[PDB]
Design a protein around this ligand. Structure first.
Ligand SMILES: [Mg+2]
Ligand SMILES: [Mg+2]
Ligand SMILES: [Mg+2]
Ligand SMILES: [Mg+2]
Lengths: 269, 260
């Protein structure tokens, strides 16, 4: 089971307990997110980028997952665009990604978020340690998407990201500073995972099984993370230019991607 | 770890007993003197042992000795045959009191009516292996169980969860209790998780060198069948080796991340 794997025990009690409760009530959240995904591939807007205090620089968690989704959208026949901050744009350049310009919800068939800050109750943006984020927000377009009724999907691994507002109670209860940190921004479908990137791959993995083709094949976790790390995107925990994400080294992320590919291939045969 | 390792039964268990893997691990590490490991799960109608369990028993067996303890295995004859190549100590006329720890990796447990059932409610007709866990509990001897369906030794500890989630549950849920219980998708993974956890507790990767493919093909050739297809395929629980290899590699990396 993909939804389970992407939530593997990291050492982060919060996310795990959120997953347990969230899943007890929405057992098939990953599949539901996948149906919405598959049904609206015409023109997908993908948003990522999470500034990290005190520098306010974007981290390694989120961009890779976005890239993986983008790649899958095109393989399935749709078009995609990415909405992020400057550094993240530079980091993804080697991959020739279409960058969204003066985007309006109406223009897209689906808008997905991978590790993007979501407004808290007090209208402010917070990191997992309760440090206010100072930088132009990206969640604004989701509020408009929701008001227009345009399909929305959120991926997060902490409680403070876009789409997390759907399970705000779970965050307040299981995560530190949850009351002040939890985002209120809702999403039509939500994917919770231990590492946002993983949640992203899980979507692709499930889509792959739904379609009968492994859309994850070719993905080189190592290369992608080294590339964006080189380009200046920092690790969210060590807050340094280490080739890792969420304080975890590549062997673990690489292992999850490989198992995902394996599970997908098995299910397809 | 406790996660990487029916899904609804696990889901509830981890919510009720959040530290079941850690607690199992603690017990494991504090009673390595002489460990009795029991496996072997008959598959009706043939009543021949499957590929799920023995590989797990073997990995635990290896870890006990690497930690300075001694291990013995209690199983059915074909499983003995299958494990022979690994130079495993077999148990002879074993007594509860003789061990500091008794562990079960996918072994059938009596149901409420004293009989043994497969997850499909077919009756398992072959000599029990669970009696020693009943006496072990009455004697106060540390006991750990690993299972993946609800009819295995140790599953008695969460009987309420099995009767509710599993089909035929009321009839097949095992009554046999164990002090600590490890629930997992595939029992082998449950056993590996135990070793992976012990590894982290000990600052040493006890799974290093574990060759999943090697083990499964070996016991498969030896005669042990895939539980789901009931055939001589080199798989366990109807899942091909590459998924199991991936699970093991993931566990090894998690351990490394923690150790270093
Ligand atoms: Mg993160
Ligand atoms: Mg986060
Ligand atoms: Mg079973
Ligand atoms: Mg099994």
């Amino acid at each position: 089971m993909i939804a389970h794997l992407i939530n593997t025990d990291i050492g982060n009690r919060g996310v795990l307990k959120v997953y347990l409760d969230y899943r007890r009530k929405n057992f098939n959240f990953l599949h539901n997110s996948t149906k919405m995904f598959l049904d609206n591939l015409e023109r997908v807007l993908i948003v990522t980028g999470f500034p990290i205090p005190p520098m306010m620089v974007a981290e390694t968690d989120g961009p890779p997952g976005a890239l993986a989704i983008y790649r899958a959208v095109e393989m399935l026949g749709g078009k995609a665009e990415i909405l992020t901050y400057s550094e993240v744009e530079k980091a993804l350049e080697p991959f020739g990604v279409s960058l969204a310009r003066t985007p309006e919800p109406e223009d897209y068939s689906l808008i997905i978020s991978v590790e993007t800050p979501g407004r808290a109750a007090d209208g402010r943006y917070y990191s997992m340690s309760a440090l206010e984020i100072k930088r132009d927000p990206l969640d604004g377009i989701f509020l408009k998407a929701r008001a227009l009724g345009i399909p929305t999907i959120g991926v997060g691994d902490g409680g403070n990201e876009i789409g997390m507002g759907k399970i705000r109670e779970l965050v307040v209860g299981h995560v530190p500073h949850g009351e002040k940190i939890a985002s209120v921004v809702e999403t039509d479908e939500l994917i919770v995972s231990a590492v946002s990137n993983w949640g992203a791959y899980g979507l692709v993995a499930q889509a792959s099984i739904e379609v009968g083709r492994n859309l994850l094949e070719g993905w080189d976790e190592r290369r992608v993370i080294e590339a964006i790390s080189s380009a200046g995107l920092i690790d969210g925990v060590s807050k340094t230019l280490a080739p890792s994400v969420d304080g975890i080294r590549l062997m673990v992320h690489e292992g999850i991607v490989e198992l995902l590919k394996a599970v997908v291939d098995e299910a397809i045969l």
